[PDB]
Design a protein around this ligand. Structure first.
Ligand SMILES: [Cl-]
Ligand SMILES: [Cl-]
Ligand SMILES: [Cl-]
Ligand SMILES: [Mg+2]
Ligand SMILES: [Mg+2]
Ligand SMILES: [Mg+2]
Ligand SMILES: [Mg+2]
Ligand SMILES: [Mg+2]
Ligand SMILES: [Mg+2]
Ligand SMILES: [Mg+2]
Ligand SMILES: [Mg+2]
Ligand SMILES: [Mg+2]
Ligand code: NI
Ligand code: NI
Lengths: 361, 351, 369, 361
């Protein structure tokens, strides 16, 4: 019955409290380029979503190539929405994800149900958080991590995947300033070749640390997994159910990181999440980056996941200084929760969103 | 919302052509909405459905029926196995979720992918002229997919499969379902002797290991049923290339929550499903049709209209066969309403 | 001369703990177990007995109900059957009911008890012959503060126990402390098994086995599934034990072929009775796999079954057994094994060699005839 | 109860057909069988028989090593009897088997039970029989198989494993004179290399036949298993629980042949049988050869095996002309059964056995 009448695309800068974020391969960003999507219906309801990769041009040009073909369609038939887009455009999961998420928001609004119920039921009241720690000098990384620990975070993900020696130093320096019970993940974001990775995991093999996504490919990464007894996490190479199943059958990892937009939206993320639970694979529920609306999606998928299989999530809104939505999850002593309001539970602040850089109708 | 009572009904389901013991479950909430489901195994086994529900129910009073993930965790913690007792609880909660959200089940299961769905016809082994006349009638009402029961004497089964393949249109599909009835050596002989027929082989043996042994020796399209009992065994089969299709029985796998996950895994790996259950009346058939409607045609080998095969209607708003196919309404939940005159008084109440 | 089953009577009995509470993985705990005793009556006047006691409280509706409802569903199919034809008994049960190994186990064991009585032989002979006069025992150590686990272990080692099963599979960091603390209080020759009872995910298990890699400890059942456990197996050089996932000869065969473990625990009732347990036992011997002979829990009648199976296992392949009856406060049968200096034996009386104490078992909660 | 004496008897078993021939040009006209009798201090006696396909001299000199170690021991403790035998003599299943079997007979006698009850319980009232067909000219094997079919036998093992071309002709000639429902196993008894086996199974691929033990080794035999769609049987390489488990785990066969004496006695055979049942593997329950006493053991093991997993048994006593015991199984219409008498249920005809050829006390 309900039909999509317009898709609007908004652009908003998300600056960083820390001023810069840096990771593997020397990459950095000072101000993130976020895109918010609004889907309007013929019955007054509107759905929202956000995509913010580490790219933003591709999100918006991707949306150009997808949106016109969704006009008139039913936003509540989420399977059919996804079918159209996949038939419309190869790849571009970053353009696809916000359409999918905005449709789930509409589904929640139309049904009067918060997303965690619609994603399978509330499995936990609130959710464990990690803080990502930008790639810098070892002693600076150590200092920032003490700060965040003092705010109540108990899980941390270092951005290594730089020079191998540098990273050995970074992992040592940060592990040394944490308390025993705090959890430290070294996330290379693909920045090592296997001989580099071998040297890093060799030199930290007695540290209480997790090794995450050492190399670019699945095969290179498994080569590392087979040489360490340290608990091991795959992230970028797990982009859908097929690669996930393969990694499960082949014992390629102990945990995965699930980036909602990278895998193409909530529909896909949910499938992977249900698969993992079935095989005892805990997940970090996150995304590439974002603000209030990205954080809301994260928190709803996470709350619908048992604590047992939530390794961690993160709260991207607190990393930035610009608020783009009201009713977003907030962090209290290192943990996040949501309200029980319908859909994502959020209300965009149109004054900061400004004018839509694109309309489709 | 809170579950305030679980009531258990018994109903005899006679066949048109001997009587099955079906169980219907009603869940009542402190808000007036009620959820329904049905479970009917082949039979004995109905006792276990009702004893399982007896063991489950007390743990569910007070719970939020809409938190379907929590309902399932609670059931799995209280009781091991018994998928036939867990399944109607799960489905009745899905029906409540539809009711509370005013959405048909196919939408809540991921969205309508098919306006209506294919069915299949089991072909009784009779004199070749009686078969051929029935086939003409089946073909006239839209049927193009057919099944025969095998899994008995190997040489007899070889004959039956040849006989039945002969009387069908070349474009018709034929599935030989051994229903686990063969040992490895029997199965090898049968699939060996029909290697040049356009036939599917379904569930030759009792276990996964035995079935895989047969799989590795035949090029014929290969279907597993009984041994694919959950997402875990499914992923095993997927990774080991143990089968081209499956038969998905909603109750045997423990409900829609589990069937849905299995359904999505199959889609992702190009594995079509026969979507049915062990048996049932109107309310089992509704669950089947909603799940089949949320599956694309490409991955629906067929569904089944069990209610066509009985003589007692137990719910209104049920799916109905028209011209070899079945659909659902868009009413909330399963879209059915039970006919309580037929169901009788509860055989059990929990509160 | 063809003996037939005339009735099945089912008794319920509470079994409290000397220690007051027993705690294991996932924050599970019990203070009073809910045990079931089965009595198989025959037209000759001979009776067979068995006990089954899964991990659960008499004070909540738990797994013991499923033992008793499973017996309810089996019983009608057993009336008139020949209980000495144990193969047929098991075939009749499997046809009647899927799963419910805890319901089927005591019927099988009670039929063995009847075979022993009909033949005048003790179970250990019918199960293959006495290979040991008495059997080494381990003590299960409840999951608590490391200091309390360490202190209880010292007490039990002083009573003569030389082997121990820690109940870990809680929080990983706690479990690391528990394993160090308890290993430290035991002489080198005492054996220490860290039994997770499926209580860890693989990343948790990886951290724990990495942190105890240099201790003389065994790691048992780290994770829920076979696949998750084998992933831990491949990353540790420590001796490795499987338990819950070895539910029968088929998974046992799989684990042997794939080098998934160095030892197993054999829980008689969980595998579905002495007939299944014996097959698995003999297969273990042929492949050089030591076994812990045990059960989920129980009192004197469980303990008798354990003792007979253990006695019929060569010492070389008996990693241990346990005497569940000395963990509790309530005696339910005469003629049961009694630990002496960390070991138990049996009498040569026919069958299990036990006679229940009906003052304690009370009135049957069900009779089927 | 304890063993007070062990007597060893020798008896010639001639063939009704005058000769039996099998792979590699082998043949025998008169079998040299050994019967063991174990005396106890209570006056009960246990009996067994072993008759391998010289081998007999091996059985008897093996017993010469074993028996003295058993005087004084408890024969109802079958496990301890076996352990004493294994610590005395490495290998020699044919020498150990009749001891193990004779103790099972004693256990039956001491308990008042027939062996089929002590081996696990009656599973069939009577059992299907096959006739072994001697390796001769095709038309001779064909004429003999017809006569045996006329007597009621519905199953047959050809003794092939000779020249490949001859074997192809044998298998064609015999298949063609049988009713459709009769089963035909082509048993090469290891007599082919794999190029020979490949030609044979290629040439008979459209016949309704089973292929048994084509080659000497497990590895060579599996190579044939993977090439053919025909049902496949292993025999000689399945010599114990360990090779059986390897075969099961590797999907090396659809059925097995279980030779009681070759695997070391009823104890090991029961173990193997019970494992075969668990994994859905039907068995041919047999032995190398023998008279009435070997037959009684076969029949008791067959009777405690469900019909579904009894591919067949054979009644060796009907192949020969010398009766050595009363109470033995007698084939009636291609089936045999046992009485319910205790133990093996037989009593040796001492008249036929003659004076013991060895005595131990
Ligand atoms: Cl049908
Ligand atoms: Cl008695
Ligand atoms: Cl010739
Ligand atoms: Mg690099
Ligand atoms: Mg990452
Ligand atoms: Mg018609
Ligand atoms: Mg069959
Ligand atoms: Mg089927
Ligand atoms: Mg845990
Ligand atoms: Mg254990
Ligand atoms: Mg040759
Ligand atoms: Mg042979
Ligand atoms: Ni593009
Ligand atoms: Ni039950």
């Amino acid at each position: 019955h309900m039909k999509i009448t317009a898709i609007n695309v908004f652009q908003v800068d998300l600056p960083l409290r820390e001023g810069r974020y840096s990771w593997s391969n020397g990459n950095f960003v000072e101000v993130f380029d976020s895109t918010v999507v609004e889907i309007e219906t013929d019955e007054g309801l509107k759905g929202y979503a956000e995509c913010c990769p580490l790219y933003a041009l591709g999100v918006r040009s991707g949306l150009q190539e997808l949106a016109p073909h969704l006009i008139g369609k039913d936003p509540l038939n989420i399977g059919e929405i996804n079918r159209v887009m996949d038939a419309a455009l190869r790849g571009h999961p970053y353009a696809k994800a916000p359409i999918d998420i905005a449709c789930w928001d509409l589904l929640g609004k139309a049904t009067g149900q918060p997303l965690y119920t619609l994603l399978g039921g509330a499995a936990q009241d609130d959710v464990a958080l990690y803080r990502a720690i930008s790639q810098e000098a070892p002693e600076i990384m150590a200092k920032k991590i003490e700060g965040y620990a003092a705010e109540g975070y108990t899980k941390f993900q270092l951005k290594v995947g730089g020079d191998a020696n540098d990273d050995i130093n970074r992992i040592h320096a940060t592990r040394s300033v944490l308390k025993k019970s705090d959890l430290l993940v070294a996330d290379a974001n693909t920045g090592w070749t296997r001989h580099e990775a071998a040297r890093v995991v060799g030199a930290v093999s007695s540290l209480d640390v997790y090794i995450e996504q050492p190399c670019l490919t699945y095969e290179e990464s498994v080569s590392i997994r087979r040489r360490t007894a340290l608990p091991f996490v795959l992230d970028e190479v797990i982009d859908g159910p097929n690669t996930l199943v393969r990694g499960i059958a082949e014992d390629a990892m102990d945990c995965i990181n699930l980036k909602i937009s990278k895998v193409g939206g909530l529909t896909k993320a949910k499938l992977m999440r249900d698969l993992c639970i079935a095989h005892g694979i805990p997940m970090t529920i996150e995304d590439t980056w974002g603000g209030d609306i990205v954080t809301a999606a994260i928190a709803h998928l996470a709350r619908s996941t048992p604590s047992e299989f939530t390794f961690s999530a993160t709260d991207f809104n607190s990393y930035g200084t610009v608020d783009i939505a009201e009713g977003a999850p907030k962090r209290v002593n290192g943990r996040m929760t949501t309200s029980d309001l319908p859909g994502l539970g959020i209300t965009p602040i149109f004054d900061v969103l400004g004018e839509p850089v694109a309309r489709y109708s």
